[model samples]
Target: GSEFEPDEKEQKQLNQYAKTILFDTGKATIKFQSAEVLNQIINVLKKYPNSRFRIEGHTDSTGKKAKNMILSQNRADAVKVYLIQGGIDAGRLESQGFGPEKPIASNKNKKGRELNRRVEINLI
Candidate 1:
């Protein structure tokens, strides 16, 4: 029922709609504001019956290596679970956690570290 297209057709769509799902300082639980954004994602997905997505979770380099890995994976899984609970088909979703391996910004400062802690969803 929504007119918004997937990221493939509009890079701006990704910027406008593909918001980063943030979490607590070091927890996998999605922040409260991020939950509301997921609602929009659900609506967007509902508009494309055949669409598939890869939910990727990234983290900053401020934590232990193994722990960060687990947290990232857990965060990614949380998003997947949330989406499925919101009526999105599980078959259309996949999740991965890079855990500080792939960062869009430097992890050297507060702003950069915050930017690094995010979830990126890509159309598949």
Candidate 2:
């Protein structure tokens, strides 16, 4: 561990932006409107080049788990590439997909399901 463990406020901001990035169905295309929030994350990440972050991709349990894994993988990879393009060092970031395996909320309802479909970033 290091003193630059990432500030709590910055981590929350990153999480907020990650949750807002939308991916096209059946595709990993980054939603155009998601650019703004990603830009914010870029700035925050750039401020701490000493830290490494992991991009976590998750999907709601609405389809084949294997297929969902593919989508989630590509989506998370897409986000990783975006951050790289935004000028963050590629070595400082990693991406992984959970494919509905790690739900933050229940998938039994629309609201919870929506929350379950998300991308999160964690300091590693």
Best by TM-score: 2
Model 1 local distance difference test score: 0.79
Runs of candidate 1 exceeding 4 Å displacement:
1-20
Candidate 2 worst ten-residue window by lDDT: 1-10
**C-alpha positional error of residue 105 in candidate 1 after TM-score superposition, expressed in Å:** 1.3
lDDT for position 8 in model 1? 55
* Model 1: per-residue Cα lDDT over 6-123, one tens digit each: 6555434643454566677778886778777888888777787577788888888987978888888998899999999999999999999888998888888999987787787787
lDDT of 2 by residue, 1-124 (tens): 2447668877887898789988777778888898998998888887778899999889999989999999998899999999999999999999998999999889999999889989899999
lDDT of 2 at 7: 80
Best by lDDT: 2
